[PDB]
């Protein structure tokens, strides 16, 4: 119940999420190997790049598992600097563009203040918080809609910087809102069954945010969309 039922679900979900890139790896490798007379040079190269890009996705999924274990062990440390958040967000936005296009999701960025927005943070780790939020914005986007988006909004509030990740996705039921930040927790519904994941992303993101002295909360309505709020002190 506690975690045990969720642990068995978690274990099955690692299997499922990794099996997808691995399927592409193996099919594309075997195809090159058995079809060398039947590939032109554009195609050979494209098939190699699939292998490489799918390895990359699998690698990201392993790094999630690692980072989580490192957090459950208070070993994950943070190193703050002075970063232009406008630049950090625009870089994160670029990193997800291909994944968002594959799901027909437009990815937007607005700053409510003028840029730059220097702030004292670990840039790797906040890039990782943003990528988890941007990825979820894509993963949990509406199934068939012509205007799907994920928007990053930057502002300066209560001393700190407020980062909102807004979507017009499936949204999150009331009962679930309390629990989404829990390790292994995933909403199970007819709108999430095909979507891969472990339930670790938001537990990791919550821990990184808290290590910076900030907090993260959510506002959602089912069928409309969700807003994830990340407040981190400026310094």
């Amino acid at each position: 119940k506690r975690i045990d039922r969720m642990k068995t679900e978690f274990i099955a979900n690692i299997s499922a999420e990794l099996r997808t890139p691995l399927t592409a790896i193996k099919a594309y490798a075997e195809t090159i190997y058995n079809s060398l007379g039947e590939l032109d040079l554009s195609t050979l190269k494209e098939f190699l790049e699939v292998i490489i890009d799918q390895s990359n996705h699998l690698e990201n999924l392993l790094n999630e598992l690692l980072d989580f274990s490192r957090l459950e062990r208070k070993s994950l440390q943070i190193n703050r600097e002075k970063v232009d958040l406008c630049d950090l967000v625009e870089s994160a936005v670029n990193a997800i563009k291909e994944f968002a296009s594959s799901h027909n999701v437009n990815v937007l960025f607005e700053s409510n203040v003028p840029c730059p927005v220097e702030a004292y943070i670990d840039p790797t780790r906040i890039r990782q918080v943003l990528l988890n939020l941007l990825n979820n914005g894509v993963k949990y986007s509406k199934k068939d809609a012509p205007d799907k988006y994920v928007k990053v909004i930057l502002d300066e509030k209560d001393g700190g910087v407020l980062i909102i990740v807004e979507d017009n996705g499936i949204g999150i039921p009331d009962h679930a809102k309390d629990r989404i930040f829990e390790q292994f927790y995933r909403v199970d519904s007819s709108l999430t069954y095909e979507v891969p994941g472990t339930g670790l992303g938001l537990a990791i993101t919550k821990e990184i945010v808290e290590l910076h002295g900030g907090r993260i909360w959510v506002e959602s309505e089912v069928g409309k969309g969700s807003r994830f709020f990340v407040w981190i002190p400026k310094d």
């Binding site: 499922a16 997808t20 399927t23 099919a27 098939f47 699939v50 799918q54 199934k143 095909e194």
Partner: protein, 120 residues
């Protein structure tokens, strides 16, 4: 000139299966989800359907069920190509009318043997 309807939500996956079917001289029509697949049966009858299970909008179990509910659709052989590993998943798909269930990750040459066998 055998025609295959290939149904899967992964563009990456469709690309590789399609490559392999075209090496044999088959034509390929692609659908991104179960509903789109049933919509394309409005314009042709395939000689074979290659079907995934876990798709948005309409899953493969619902596709297989709806394929038995229409006279014109029920005799088109279906190979299910899925990451669902369980014996129960396979049994359900076979009970829903699939001719063959193949697990992912898959061998492309084994998959093509099974395709050939159902086509002949």
């Amino acid at each position: 000139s055998k025609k295959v309807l290939l149904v899967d939500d992964s563009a990456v996956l469709r690309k590789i299966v399609s490559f392999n079917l075209k090496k044999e001289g088959y034509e390929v029509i692609e659908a991104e989800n179960g509903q789109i697949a049933l919509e394309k049966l409005s314009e042709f009858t395939p000689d074979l359907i290659v079907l995934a299970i876990m798709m948005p909008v309409m899953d493969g179990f619902t596709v297989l069920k709806k394929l038995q509910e229409k006279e014109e659709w029920k005799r088109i052989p279906v190979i299910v190509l899925t990451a669902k590993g369980g014996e129960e998943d396979e049994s359900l798909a076979l009970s829903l009318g699939a001719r063959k269930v193949m697990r992912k990750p898959f061998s492309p040459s084994q998959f093509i043997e099974e395709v050939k066998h159902l086509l002949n």
